CSV table of C-alpha atoms and ligand atoms in Angstrom, one decimal:
chain,number,residue,atom,x,y,z
A,1,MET,CA,242.7,84.7,-48.4
A,2,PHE,CA,241.9,85.7,-44.3
A,3,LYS,CA,245.1,88.0,-43.1
A,4,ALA,CA,244.6,87.1,-39.6
A,5,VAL,CA,243.9,84.8,-36.8
A,6,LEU,CA,241.4,86.3,-33.9
A,7,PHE,CA,242.3,83.1,-30.4
A,8,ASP,CA,240.1,83.2,-27.6
A,9,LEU,CA,242.5,81.9,-25.0
A,10,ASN,CA,240.9,80.2,-22.1
A,11,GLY,CA,239.6,77.2,-23.4
A,12,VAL,CA,240.8,77.6,-27.4
A,13,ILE,CA,245.2,77.7,-26.2
A,14,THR,CA,245.6,75.8,-23.0
A,15,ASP,CA,241.8,76.0,-20.1
A,16,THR,CA,242.4,78.0,-16.8
A,17,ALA,CA,238.7,77.5,-16.2
A,18,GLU,CA,239.2,75.6,-12.9
A,19,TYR,CA,241.5,78.1,-11.1
A,20,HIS,CA,239.4,80.2,-12.9
A,21,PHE,CA,236.4,78.9,-10.5
A,22,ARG,CA,238.8,77.5,-8.1
A,23,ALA,CA,239.8,80.6,-6.9
A,24,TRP,CA,236.8,82.6,-7.2
A,25,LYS,CA,234.5,80.3,-5.3
A,26,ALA,CA,237.7,80.6,-2.2
A,27,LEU,CA,237.5,84.7,-2.4
A,28,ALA,CA,233.4,84.0,-2.4
A,29,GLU,CA,233.0,81.4,0.8
A,30,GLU,CA,235.5,84.4,2.6
A,31,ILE,CA,233.3,86.7,2.2
A,32,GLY,CA,230.4,85.4,2.9
A,33,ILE,CA,228.4,84.6,-0.3
A,34,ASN,CA,226.6,81.2,-1.3
A,35,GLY,CA,225.9,80.2,-5.2
A,36,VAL,CA,229.3,81.1,-6.9
A,37,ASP,CA,228.6,77.4,-8.4
A,38,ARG,CA,230.1,76.1,-11.6
A,39,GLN,CA,227.1,76.9,-13.4
A,40,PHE,CA,228.0,80.5,-12.4
A,41,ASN,CA,231.9,79.8,-13.7
A,42,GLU,CA,231.6,78.8,-16.6
A,43,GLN,CA,229.0,82.6,-17.6
A,44,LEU,CA,232.0,84.1,-16.8
A,45,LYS,CA,234.2,82.5,-19.8
A,46,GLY,CA,235.8,86.0,-21.2
A,47,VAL,CA,233.8,88.2,-18.9
A,48,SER,CA,236.6,90.5,-16.7
A,49,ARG,CA,238.2,90.4,-13.6
A,50,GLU,CA,235.7,93.3,-12.5
A,51,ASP,CA,232.6,92.3,-14.6
A,52,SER,CA,233.1,88.7,-12.6
A,53,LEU,CA,234.1,89.7,-9.2
A,54,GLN,CA,230.4,91.7,-9.8
A,55,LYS,CA,228.5,89.0,-10.3
A,56,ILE,CA,230.0,87.6,-7.7
A,57,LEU,CA,228.9,90.6,-5.5
A,58,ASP,CA,225.5,91.1,-7.1
A,59,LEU,CA,224.8,88.2,-5.4
A,60,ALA,CA,224.0,89.0,-2.1
A,61,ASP,CA,223.5,92.4,-2.8
A,62,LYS,CA,227.1,92.8,-1.6
A,63,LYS,CA,227.6,97.2,-1.9
A,64,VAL,CA,232.0,97.6,-1.1
A,65,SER,CA,234.1,100.8,-1.3
A,66,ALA,CA,236.1,101.0,-3.9
A,67,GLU,CA,239.8,100.3,-2.4
A,68,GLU,CA,237.4,97.4,-0.6
A,69,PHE,CA,237.0,96.0,-5.1
A,70,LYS,CA,239.8,96.5,-5.7
A,71,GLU,CA,241.5,93.8,-2.3
A,72,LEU,CA,238.9,91.3,-3.1
A,73,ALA,CA,239.3,91.8,-6.8
A,74,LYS,CA,243.8,91.4,-6.1
A,75,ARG,CA,243.4,88.9,-3.5
A,76,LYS,CA,241.3,86.4,-6.1
A,77,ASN,CA,244.2,87.1,-9.0
A,78,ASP,CA,246.8,86.5,-6.4
A,79,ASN,CA,245.2,83.3,-5.3
A,80,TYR,CA,244.8,82.3,-9.0
A,81,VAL,CA,248.3,83.0,-9.9
A,82,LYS,CA,249.4,80.4,-8.0
A,83,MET,CA,247.3,78.1,-8.4
A,84,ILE,CA,248.9,78.5,-12.8
A,85,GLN,CA,252.4,78.3,-11.5
A,86,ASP,CA,253.1,75.1,-13.0
A,87,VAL,CA,251.5,76.0,-16.4
A,88,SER,CA,254.1,74.6,-19.4
A,89,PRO,CA,254.4,74.3,-22.7
A,90,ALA,CA,253.6,71.1,-21.9
A,91,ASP,CA,249.3,72.6,-20.9
A,92,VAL,CA,249.7,74.0,-25.0
A,93,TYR,CA,246.3,72.1,-26.1
A,94,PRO,CA,246.0,69.8,-29.6
A,95,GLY,CA,246.9,71.5,-32.8
A,96,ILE,CA,247.6,74.7,-31.1
A,97,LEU,CA,251.0,75.2,-31.0
A,98,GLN,CA,251.4,73.2,-35.1
A,99,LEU,CA,248.3,75.6,-35.8
A,100,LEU,CA,250.3,79.1,-34.9
A,101,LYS,CA,253.9,77.8,-37.4
A,102,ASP,CA,251.3,77.8,-40.0
A,103,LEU,CA,250.3,80.3,-39.2
A,104,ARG,CA,253.7,81.9,-38.8
A,105,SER,CA,255.3,80.8,-42.3
A,106,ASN,CA,251.9,81.7,-44.4
A,107,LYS,CA,252.9,85.5,-43.1
A,108,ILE,CA,248.8,85.2,-41.4
A,109,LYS,CA,249.1,87.1,-38.7
A,110,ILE,CA,247.9,85.7,-35.2
A,111,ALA,CA,246.4,88.1,-32.0
A,112,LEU,CA,245.8,87.0,-28.8
A,113,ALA,CA,241.5,88.3,-28.2
A,114,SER,CA,241.1,86.8,-24.2
A,115,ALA,CA,239.3,89.0,-22.0
A,116,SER,CA,241.8,88.0,-19.1
A,117,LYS,CA,245.4,90.1,-17.9
A,118,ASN,CA,247.8,87.2,-17.8
A,119,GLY,CA,247.1,86.4,-20.6
A,120,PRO,CA,251.1,88.1,-21.6
A,121,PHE,CA,252.0,86.0,-18.6
A,122,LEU,CA,250.0,82.1,-19.8
A,123,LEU,CA,251.7,82.5,-23.5
A,124,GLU,CA,255.6,82.8,-22.0
A,125,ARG,CA,254.7,80.5,-20.2
A,126,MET,CA,253.8,78.1,-22.4
A,127,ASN,CA,256.5,79.8,-24.4
A,128,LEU,CA,254.0,81.2,-26.9
A,129,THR,CA,254.8,84.0,-27.1
A,130,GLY,CA,257.1,85.2,-30.6
A,131,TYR,CA,253.5,83.2,-32.5
A,132,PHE,CA,252.0,86.3,-31.7
A,133,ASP,CA,251.9,89.1,-33.5
A,134,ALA,CA,250.0,91.7,-31.1
A,135,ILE,CA,247.5,90.7,-27.6
A,136,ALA,CA,244.5,92.4,-26.8
A,137,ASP,CA,245.2,94.4,-23.3
A,138,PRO,CA,241.9,93.9,-21.4
A,139,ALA,CA,242.6,96.7,-20.0
A,140,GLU,CA,242.4,99.0,-22.6
A,141,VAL,CA,240.2,97.2,-23.8
A,142,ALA,CA,238.0,96.4,-21.4
A,143,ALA,CA,234.9,95.6,-21.9
A,144,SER,CA,233.3,91.5,-21.1
A,145,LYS,CA,232.4,89.2,-24.0
A,146,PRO,CA,229.6,89.3,-26.2
A,147,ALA,CA,230.7,92.9,-26.6
A,148,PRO,CA,233.3,92.4,-29.8
A,149,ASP,CA,235.3,95.2,-28.7
A,150,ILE,CA,237.8,92.7,-27.8
A,151,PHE,CA,237.8,91.3,-31.3
A,152,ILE,CA,238.0,95.1,-33.2
A,153,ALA,CA,241.0,95.8,-31.0
A,154,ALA,CA,243.4,92.4,-31.4
A,155,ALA,CA,242.6,93.1,-35.6
A,156,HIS,CA,243.3,96.6,-35.3
A,157,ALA,CA,246.3,95.5,-33.0
A,158,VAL,CA,247.7,93.2,-36.8
A,159,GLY,CA,246.5,95.8,-39.0
A,160,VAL,CA,244.2,93.9,-40.1
A,161,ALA,CA,240.2,94.3,-40.5
A,162,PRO,CA,238.2,92.4,-38.7
A,163,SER,CA,236.0,91.2,-41.7
A,164,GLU,CA,239.9,89.3,-42.6
A,165,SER,CA,240.0,87.9,-40.1
A,166,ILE,CA,238.8,84.4,-38.2
A,167,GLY,CA,238.6,84.4,-34.2
A,168,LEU,CA,239.1,80.9,-31.7
A,169,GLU,CA,236.6,80.5,-29.7
A,170,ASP,CA,234.8,78.2,-26.7
A,171,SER,CA,232.2,79.9,-25.5
A,172,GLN,CA,228.6,81.6,-26.2
A,173,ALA,CA,229.1,84.6,-25.8
A,174,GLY,CA,232.5,84.7,-27.4
A,175,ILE,CA,231.4,83.2,-31.0
A,176,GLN,CA,228.6,86.5,-30.6
A,177,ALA,CA,232.3,88.9,-29.9
A,178,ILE,CA,233.2,88.0,-32.8
A,179,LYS,CA,230.2,88.3,-35.4
A,180,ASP,CA,229.1,91.0,-34.3
A,181,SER,CA,233.6,92.3,-34.4
A,182,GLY,CA,232.7,91.2,-38.3
A,183,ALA,CA,235.2,88.9,-38.4
A,184,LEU,CA,234.4,84.6,-38.9
A,185,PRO,CA,233.7,82.8,-36.0
A,186,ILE,CA,234.7,78.8,-35.4
A,187,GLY,CA,234.4,77.0,-32.5
A,188,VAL,CA,235.6,74.8,-30.9
A,189,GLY,CA,232.8,72.5,-28.5
A,190,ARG,CA,228.8,71.3,-29.5
A,191,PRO,CA,226.7,73.0,-32.0
A,192,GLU,CA,223.9,72.8,-29.1
A,193,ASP,CA,226.1,74.8,-26.5
A,194,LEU,CA,227.7,77.4,-29.3
A,195,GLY,CA,225.1,76.7,-32.1
A,196,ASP,CA,224.2,75.2,-35.6
A,197,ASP,CA,224.8,78.0,-37.8
A,198,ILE,CA,228.6,78.4,-37.8
A,199,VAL,CA,231.3,75.8,-37.9
A,200,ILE,CA,232.3,73.7,-34.9
A,201,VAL,CA,234.8,70.3,-34.2
A,202,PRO,CA,234.6,68.9,-31.4
A,203,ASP,CA,238.8,69.9,-30.0
A,204,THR,CA,241.8,71.6,-30.7
A,205,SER,CA,243.0,68.4,-32.6
A,206,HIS,CA,240.3,70.2,-36.1
A,207,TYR,CA,241.8,73.5,-36.0
A,208,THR,CA,244.4,73.3,-38.7
A,209,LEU,CA,245.7,75.7,-41.3
A,210,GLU,CA,243.5,73.6,-44.2
A,211,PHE,CA,240.8,74.0,-42.5
A,212,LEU,CA,240.7,77.4,-41.6
A,213,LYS,CA,241.2,77.6,-45.1
A,214,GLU,CA,238.2,75.7,-45.9
A,215,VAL,CA,235.6,77.4,-43.8
A,216,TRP,CA,237.3,80.2,-44.9
A,217,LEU,CA,236.5,79.5,-48.9
A,218,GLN,CA,233.2,77.6,-48.3
B,301,XGP,O1,241.9,87.9,-13.7
B,301,XGP,P1,241.6,87.8,-15.2
B,301,XGP,O2,242.5,87.4,-15.9
B,301,XGP,O3,241.8,89.0,-15.8
B,301,XGP,O4,240.9,87.6,-16.0
B,301,XGP,C1,239.7,86.6,-15.6
B,301,XGP,O5,239.5,86.5,-17.3
B,301,XGP,C2,238.4,84.7,-17.1
B,301,XGP,C3,237.8,84.5,-18.8
B,301,XGP,O6,239.5,84.5,-20.0
B,301,XGP,C4,237.2,84.5,-16.7
B,301,XGP,O7,236.5,83.6,-16.6
B,301,XGP,C5,237.4,84.8,-15.1
B,301,XGP,O8,236.5,84.9,-14.1
B,301,XGP,C6,238.2,86.6,-15.4
B,301,XGP,O9,238.7,86.9,-14.3
B,302,ALF,F1,240.0,83.4,-23.2
B,302,ALF,AL1,238.8,84.1,-22.4
B,302,ALF,F2,236.4,84.1,-23.7
B,302,ALF,F3,237.5,82.1,-22.9
B,302,ALF,F4,239.2,85.8,-23.0
B,303,MG,MG1,237.5,80.6,-23.4
B,304,MG,MG1,233.9,73.2,-24.3
């Protein structure tokens, strides 16, 4: 059987993308940059804070000092952290808590493979920390999806080969990252968006231990 499940955060466990959009758009507008729209933000799925900011600067060919860059990223992050202060166990997506319980009871390792450095805070707010055997640290493993690095790191963090792992993802870049790690992807979303070549479920209530085992056996 598969020996680990490697979880993306946003769009899988819960979704805080709206708050990232609001905060990046506010930052861009404060510094006179146009183009941070919903289409642009959908392209930031699985993308590090620093790569995200650079994409925004690139809209206007804006050059900033390293210190200015750090301050811009901090300003946006502070705003986003204020926006997520009310996240609680209520925000957990359907099926996810039961899946975590079932994986743990079956002695299957659980790791977070998110690009967001806010992962630990979010898991704590949602009362999920105790289910996670490890959290891959994007400050140590900074490559944005679709690079496989974060998933490889998550598997190493629980002592399981990626080839013996399942990855759960809601984004194109994240699915590719899982593929290139060697793990088996199961997407959540639409096949039009995420592919007709892998198993996709329409929402997270379909992520059950039984379903993961069915997919693994096929
Ligand atoms: O600022 P962190 O929370 O570290 O990173 C975030 O990660 C998000 C992906 O989960 C991405 O969409 C954001 O643009 C990025 O700021
Ligand atoms: F939390 Al993600 F790709 F949605 F790392
Ligand atoms: Mg995601
Ligand atoms: Mg989706």
